[PDB]
Each structure stands twice: as C-alpha cells, then as structure tokens.
Amino acid sequence: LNTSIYGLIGEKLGHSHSSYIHKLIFEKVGIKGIYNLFEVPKEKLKESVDTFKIIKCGGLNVTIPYKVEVMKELYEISEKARKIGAVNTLKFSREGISGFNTDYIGFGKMLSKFRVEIKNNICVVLGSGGAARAVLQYLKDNFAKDIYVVTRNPEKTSEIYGEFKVISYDELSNLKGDVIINCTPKGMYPKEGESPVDKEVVAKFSSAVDLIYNPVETLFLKYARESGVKAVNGLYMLVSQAAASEEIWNDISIDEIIVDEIFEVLEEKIKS
Amino acid sequence: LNTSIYGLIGEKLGHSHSSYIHKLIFEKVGIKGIYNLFEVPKEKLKESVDTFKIIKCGGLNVTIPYKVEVMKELYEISEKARKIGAVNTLKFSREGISGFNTDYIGFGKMLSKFRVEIKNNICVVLGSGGAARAVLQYLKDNFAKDIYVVTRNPEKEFKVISYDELSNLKGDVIINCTPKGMYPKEGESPVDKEVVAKFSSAVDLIYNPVETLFLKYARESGVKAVNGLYMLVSQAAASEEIWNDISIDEIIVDEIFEVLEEKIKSE
Known about the structure:
The structure is a homodimer. Chain A has eleven helices and twelve strands. By secondary structure, chain A is an alpha/beta fold. Chain A has two domains: 1-101 and 234-272, Rossmann fold; 102-233, Rossmann fold (3-Layer(aba) Sandwich). In chain A, the strands form two sheets. Chain A has a six-stranded mixed β-sheet with strand order 2-1-3-5-6-4. A six-stranded parallel β-sheet of chain A has the order 9-8-7-10-11-12, with helices on both faces. In chain A, a hairpin with a 4-residue loop joins strand 5 and strand 6. In chain A, helix 1 packs across helix 10 (235-250) and helix 10 (235-250) crosses helix 11 (256-271). Chain A is globular. In chain A, 47% of the residues are buried. Chain A binds chain B through residues 1-3, 5, 19, 34, 36-41, 44, 47-48, 50-52, 54-55, and chain B through 1-3, 5, 7, 19, 34, 36-41, 44, 47-48, 50-52, 54-55.
C-alpha cells in the first residue's frame, strides 16, 4: 500500500505552517499521506509536473513563480481560477492535471467566520501581488459598494486592474471606507516592524483584515486594535485554503469542526 | 520538515512485501520516510529519475526492465555493480545519481546466514535470467570450484547446459533463479526431486511460498533448503545503509525476517 504524496511546488521554498496543517488534516480525516515542499527550478516545471502525474501524486499546491505558468499544463481549470488568472491547486486524475484556486475559497471562509461583511461595503485592498487577485475577484463577486486597489505603482497597476479604482498611498489618506485589507508583505518577516499604512488610515475603517498570520498581530492589526476597528489576521484563511485543497484532492468534505480545531492548534503554535 | 521519499522503480509492478520491509526498517532504525512502488513507462525513465533528483529523493531500488538501462543516467557505478552488469540501487547526491547492486550483498548475506559454503564447491544455477547475474558474479568472486548455468534452451563465462545434461550431474549447491515454483507456477519445480537429491544445499531465490516444491524435495532428500526471504530482507537493509549512510545491525534484519516469514505463510 503506497503512501499518497501531496506537496507544494515553488522555485524556492522556506518554512511553512501549511505542511503542519496538512499533516493534521490527514490524521483527522484518516488519510495516509505526506505533504512536502518541493523546490523546482523554472526551466523544469513541465518535466516535474509530468513526473508527478506519472507517480500518481495525490495533489499539489502551487506558489510563486508558477501560479500562471502552470496553467499551460492543465487540461482543465475551474471557472473561478480562470477569472482570477492563477492556479494554486492541482488535481491529478486519469485525463491529466486540472487546476483550481483555493485562496479565493479560504479568503471567503475567513470573512464569514469573523463576520466581515462585504456586500454593499467600501472595500480597500493594499498591494497588487500575493493574493490580491483572488481577494479582488471575491469582493467583486460579492457586490462591494466600491473596491479600491492601493499600490506603490499607480501607472503600472492600473494597466493590470483596469476595472477597479487604483490609487496611490497618498490618495488613500484622503479616503474613508468600511473594509481595508492588507495584501502586501509589510508586517511579516523580514518586514515585521512595518505597516503598509498609518494608524490614522486604519482608523477610518470599521474592519481591518491582514492576510498575514505570523505574527498573529501585525503593526497593521495592533493599529486597528487601538482604534476600535475589528481586526482579523490570516490564520483562518491558511487553514481553510489547506482544507479546501484536501477536499478537492481526495473528493471529501472537511467539517468546519476540523477547521477550527486545526486553527486553535496552529494559533497557539504560532504565538509560542 | 520533509518526509524522505524512497521506493522501487519498474514498468509493471505487483504488490511487494518489499514495501512493508522498508517501513519496518524505518521504524526499527528511526528514519522518517515512506517507500512507494513507482510505475514508470520506458519512455519516461530519464525524465522520472531526473525529477527524483530534483525533489531530492532519498533513494530508489530499480527492477525490471531497467536494471541495465538505468545505468546510462549514472555518474558513478560501484565496480561490483559494473562487473555484474546491473544496478538495482540508486543513491541521490548533489553531484547526481550513483548506482549499486544490493542483490549481490543480499545473496551473500543469505548464504553466510545459513552457512552455505561456496569456496571450492560445485554450483549449479538454474535459469539465466532473474538475478542470475548477481548470483553468478558472487559464485565467481567466492571461488566456486565450478559453475553451471542450466537453461531451457542453450541455443538462446561459465558452463551452460540443458536440463537433460543437468540430470547426469552431481554437485554441491543448487540454486533456483527461475520463476518456477512461485505463482502462477506453484505446482511445479524447475527440476525433479531425484536431481535435487544429488546436491548438498538447495537455495531458492523464491520466498513465496516460503517452501517451494523444489525446497520440499530438498527437505525430503536430506538436503539443506534455503528460501530467498533472508536475501530479500538483507538487500533492503543494504539499500537503506547506502541511502542513509548508516550501519544496520543484523538483529534488525533478523527481526524483520521473522515478521515477513509469518506474514508470508498466513497468506
């Protein structure tokens, strides 16, 4: 009896709370499996993916720089991932490899779980990389009043996201709204003592969402604390995105109950 | 922290008691890994091993039909593997894949374990496929007096002969490397009891069943009968020592031997 092999592929990979998460899920749902980080150089993405399909890989997450490039390899891609323009989850089957995006699903679980409403609210996104693509598709799918994308490079970014209001950090300081979301790397190692915005900016919103989960409170989120703004870090998203991958790989459903439990465990492990 | 991925590469693979052997080794020595059976089609050998290299595979055993073909992809090969002409073990390092033969080591560990002397004795090998290659290298390395290889068809280094000629012969060690005696050939023996009786040790590389018809003939004729189970457990361990650059005590090998021995019979 073979052990199912699952993992994450990226070009260079560091430590990750995701693996531990997957391994907890395998125990809880009774899957005999491992989840490894696989470093794969750019010129070899296609050949490695072919071998994964050959050894019957149980399922792969994909990160940078392969979320778009990997799409070349898939015989099919979900509607959501197509729209988002990036795949972070690969399902292997008889036909070959198909693609999904479970950042979108994770982000939605996080808003529900802390009850952050979106529909009819004014939503502000900080940064245009990392998970901004999936977060912007979600906000729009859910009928935000308006969506701002705030960038260090307004000329570049507004070519990229033409249907959203793109603005500079300067312009943001004149804006008031409901929900403000950090999609930038400020606040996480090695930029941990930084915030993407000032507290006076944070103070004009009624919910602050950081997709960073370590540290569990970024400067950005402290700021939100001090100002009376509901604060959410990205731990629930990480745990939900991993549950959702496993759902698609193993064609199962994972109880919300398994998710909070993994969440509580990881939250402690991270704060320690 | 990653689990090290080990296993076996070949084209078409049955179940193997090998994967359970490697798991036991992992547990008894304290290694975190898994050992899978990996089915690779011929056109994908190069690509597959190149991928394993990239994902830092902890090491691979190689079976039919790649023991010869895999040798193209190696940067070094032990001189024993090179003499035998076959690689069944692959070691991955930063410099590349390195090739060994642990069927040789395992056959040697099995004969020492059961005290089957080779020096200056007449040795007959039945079948000129399977690991007939490593067995034959080992007999020569250990100064057999003579070596015969018996084949269904001599027209298809040592003396080669038909079964018809084997029946005029008395020797010391008789070794089965044919698939006769193992499913689906359980009801049969590559040779007659009357032949087996003319030897003083009978070794079957087959380990399931744990007593083939050939070995029953040997038991009944007062001939030392040895099945291939100890060799299969020793080859796994020798592989693990190579991949993990460790030493594994004979005690462990002896422990897994007994487990598999009971499991095989149950079946």
